[PDB]
Design a protein around this ligand. Structure first.
Ligand SMILES: *[C@@H]1O[C@H](CO[C@@H]2O[C@@H](C)[C@@H](O)[C@@H](O)[C@@H]2O)[C@@H](O[C@@H]2O[C@H](CO)[C@@H](O)[C@H](O)[C@H]2NC(C)=O)[C@H](O)[C@H]1NC(C)=O
Ligand SMILES: *[C@@H]1O[C@H](CO[C@@H]2O[C@@H](C)[C@@H](O)[C@@H](O)[C@@H]2O)[C@@H](O[C@@H]2O[C@H](CO)[C@@H](O)[C@H](O)[C@H]2NC(C)=O)[C@H](O)[C@H]1NC(C)=O
Ligand SMILES: *[C@@H]1O[C@H](CO)[C@@H](O)[C@H](O)[C@H]1NC(C)=O
Lengths: 530, 535
């Protein structure tokens, strides 16, 4: 029996598993229960701590994926399947994973905690692209990731009610962060040095823990990749949350909040999932039905407000985006688009596309978008129109919300580092016109290219090693820089400096799409208020 | 007596003068009366045709300048004095001028008719810079120019009333064009080949004659230099014209506000001209630049609808037009009221001064509209750089007032049947007396078009003389054929179209073809901003 793989945590004993890497072994504890299964009467309710067990929990394999929608746009295609569930679906899904060096560290090791994205409707900690073995071996951190409830199960809200208060998937994450405070030392991790990192909805999640005081005591630094809590898709108001929940009930045959939730609780999980997309108020891309709700509790105001009004002295944050944030989303509803052709759209398609990519705004607002994103010397050129709509969706949903978070944090006391990720993976299965799409830096951060069974180049492995070092340096010190030799400067509201991350050495540049982001962040809100 | 210098027109006999030019003699008939003097009881009324006379009228010097405000912002400064009156002020000012080759043409000769600018408040056909002798000598056309009433005298309007109907300055212009039709053949001119040209307010006037059916039959082609009838300074609605007229009357003791129109006008007619002029600027609703108190009014009569609407809804088949702008349309206007600006320093303004200038440069729009302007013209990587802010405020004023109205006029006309040629004038005269930062300001192409550098007493370079000759040639080719191009190996000037949007650069170098008259910027002013204003 290997003693390195035996651990006692507050709730009882665990058996883990030794994993291989090209750099040597790592210890892993996968599928640890952190909450009571949120089943039956507990559906829609806040999570309860896992009660103590006797005997030894088998922590040698990933546990079930939280019930969610499964993508069928391109069956069998790698580019979509890599994001789909790779274990069975269950509502009994509240488990977390810990990776540690081998043998177990004997002194406090800095902790990275990963929160997955997936638009709050999908995702899992067990996805191959989130495999912690390479980061832990190469940079000698402890790495934790958790499952949290998604879709209606995590985010359906009838505000005011106790039977479905909203934001429970966020509370699933908080409970996991509390579990880390209490138990990570048993693995050699340092509870006083916990860095949160997430991508997309995971990044929006990280930002929400930043702005919610009960969460803020549970971690020390933050990394937000391609997402922000102030993104227009990342939260919903109380009124619209109630409407969507109420329409879900009607669509699955249920009728008083208490009677409504009770009827929802009698329905098979899969049935809720089958109607999820239909509660959206219009045809759209980059919009998701059940998301965090602003109701005074977890978030006392909108994240925008909380950001504008907060003191952030003592915080260090690492934020960034990929080169083509919008491109992936266009094939899920923009007319004329497909991964399987050049998507060289017409002006009419571009115009219809703007209403899909910027849903629920006035005609005037849409006209303003068309003005800023048309080249009036080439109003009808297909390739330029394809690129412009990509920019519309990407700027609106990701780039400009991240830029505004970065600007306001830096101006209000925090030290911020910014990047743009510009390398297109040699193995990418999406067409060339999509460039570097949403989600495709993650495999480089996790060191996935070091896996011998995969097809990355020698240069790509060295690049992954550089990225792993930046991220871990940031976790350990609040600063991604290596010892002096080109330096990564802090981002500020005036100079607006960030770096390009690709196979070449760091290049320092200015402005996260400043001209476009002035539109989304400064002008457009004024227009919408009048 | 010299037979070349004697001419009979419908009204009676005229005697003219022989002018020397560097290239040979020209005949000139300066100061020909074309209306009865709009004196006393006739103030604010439409022009009456000049009654026939016995004997011989000496048309041998320019007549008086129509009553107007005189610029004193920089006393004695050449850059401003060149625009100031160079004859005594009088309400007795409705005279026109003809220049013709010597000896008189044997076969009918194409006619150019000049309409001066000056914001509908100023200007005169007598200014040295509008001296027609060089064009006539060089290109052998006939050149006509007329005086027309400006300010309250030409454009005060109490809409509906017979006693001050408004637009009488445009009627002065039209009467002169009717005079050219009836009489130009006596000077050797061809009434079937008449080309109007004008700059700033004169260009906007030309555009209005295009959009008014009774004017349209009096000419065949048109040239619009740095102005357009659809410019936001060029016309005013009925209610605002009434408000401005009523305030003027109030400020000069009439009536002893509003009331009977007949009574109010009769009281205004008792005021000395200068008294009205001294109160002119006080009727504007806010502090501004590029705004003028008394301008043409849209009342269904001269203009049946806004110039914008008339342009959008017109058939322009059969029309050739030449349009253009100078390189720095906005700069001249900034030293007349934008915070931080002077001709005598670098005008390196702050951000706060920029923001304040936007409201002066784009007056009487909502706070939201002003915010949209600041969005478009701010470089968000350099939001506070003084030199860039100076250049941006110049662009705001120039785009809004001149470039974009001209672009819009050119695009609609091209799309709706007209042949259109467009230019940007990029040469800064060696003799220019305004500071370097102002670049090529509003009004500084005119001296080249008129061939002023050929004047020996002035100190232009030889290259500038060559340049002037090229320009005069393009303008006259356009007047003769509807096409400025030379009837070989020289670079061709292509037509302007709504899609390709091609124009040429006019400077000391050969023609260079470019695309788009500030396309990105003008899409803001012409396409988006009006939707914001409606909503
Ligand atoms: C590129 O493809 C789009 C999307 O269409 C799908 O994928 C294609 C490879 C092909 O298999 C199509 O039949 C698929 O529908 C095309 O847009 C569609 O056009 C069809 C008619 O052919 C229409 O009925 C659909 O509604 C359209 N779908 C969308 C998403 O708008 C588009 O025509 C192709 N563009 C080209 C040829 O460049
Ligand atoms: C540049 O000039 C302007 C305008 O001022 C005129 O010209 C100057 C050369 C100098 O002779 C001034 O006295 C003239 O009035 C300056 O603007 C003014 O500042 C004063 C007080 O400092 C104020 O009373 C005026 O209103 C200002 N004029 C404005 C707002 O148009 C400007 O500051 C000068 N720039 C400099 C000094 O760099
Ligand atoms: C105004 O007064 C004059 C002068 O007596 C008179 O002739 C005219 O009809 C009056 N107008 C109106 C409409 O009262």
């Amino acid at each position: 029996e290997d003693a390195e793989l035996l651990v006692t945590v507050r709730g009882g004993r665990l058996r883990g598993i030794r994993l291989k890497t090209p750099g040597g072994p790592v210890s892993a504890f996968l599928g640890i229960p952190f909450a009571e299964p949120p089943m039956g009467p507990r559906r829609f309710l806040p999570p309860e701590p896992k009660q103590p067990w006797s005997g030894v929990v088998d922590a040698t394999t990933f546990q079930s994926v939280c019930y969610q929608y499964v993508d069928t746009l391109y069956p069998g295609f790698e580019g979509t399947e890599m994001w789909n569930p790779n274990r069975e679906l269950s509502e009994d899904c509240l488990y977390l994973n810990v990776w540690t060096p081998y043998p177990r560290p004997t002194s406090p090791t800095p902790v990275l905690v990963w929160i997955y994205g997936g638009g709050f409707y999908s995702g899992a900690s067990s996805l191959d692209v989130y495999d912690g073995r390479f980061l832990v071996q190469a940079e000698r951190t402890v790495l934790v990731s958790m499952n949290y409830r998604v879709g209606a199960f995590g985010f359906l809200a009838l505000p005011g009610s106790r039977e479905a208060p909203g934001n429970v998937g966020l509370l699933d994450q908080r409970l996991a962060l509390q579990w880390v405070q209490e138990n990570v030392a048993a693995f050699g991790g340092d509870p006083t040095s916990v860095t949160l990192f997430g991508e997309s909805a995971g990044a929006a999640s990280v930002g929400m823990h930043l702005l919610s005081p009960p969460s803020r005591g549970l971690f020390h630094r933050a990394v937000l990749q391609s997402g922000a809590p102030n993104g227009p898709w990342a939260t919903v108001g109380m009124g619209e949350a109630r409407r969507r929940a109420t329409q879900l009930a009607h669509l699955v045959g249920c009728p008083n909040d208490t009677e409504l939730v009770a009827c929802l609780r009698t329905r098979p999980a899969q049935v809720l999932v089958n109607h999820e997309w239909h509660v959206l108020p219009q045809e759209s891309v980059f919009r998701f039905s059940f998301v965090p709700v602003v109701d005074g509790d977890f978030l006392s105001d909108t994240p925008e407000a909380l950001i504008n009004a907060g003191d952030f002295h003592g915080l260090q944050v690492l934020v960034g985006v990929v080169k083509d944030e919008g491109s992936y989303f266009l094939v899920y509803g923009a007319p004329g688009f497909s991964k399987d052709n050049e998507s060289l759209i017409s002006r009419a398609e571009f115009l219809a596309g703007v209403r899909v990519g910027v849903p629920q705004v006035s005609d005037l607002a849409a006209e303003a978008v068309v003005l800023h994103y048309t080249d009036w010397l080439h109003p009808e050129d297909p390739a330029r129109l394809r690129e412009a709509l990509s920019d519309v969706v990407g700027d609106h949903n990701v780039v400009c919300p991240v830029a505004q978070l970065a600007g306001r944090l830096a101006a209000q006391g925090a030290r911020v580092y910014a990047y743009v990720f510009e390398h297109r993976a040699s193995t990418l299965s999406w067409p060339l016109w999509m460039g570097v799409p949403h989600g495709y830096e993650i495999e480089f951060i996790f060191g996935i290219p070091l896996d011998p069974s995969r097809n990355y180049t020698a240069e790509e492995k060295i690049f992954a090693q550089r990225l792993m070092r930046y991220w871990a340096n940031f976790a350990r010190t609040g600063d991604p820089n290596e010892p002096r030799d080109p330096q990564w400067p802090p981002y500020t509201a005036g100079a607006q400096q960030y770096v390009s991350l690709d196979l070449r050495p760091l290049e320092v540049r200015r402005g996260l799409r400043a001209q476009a982001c002035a539109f989304w962040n400064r002008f457009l809100p004024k227009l919408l208020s009048a």
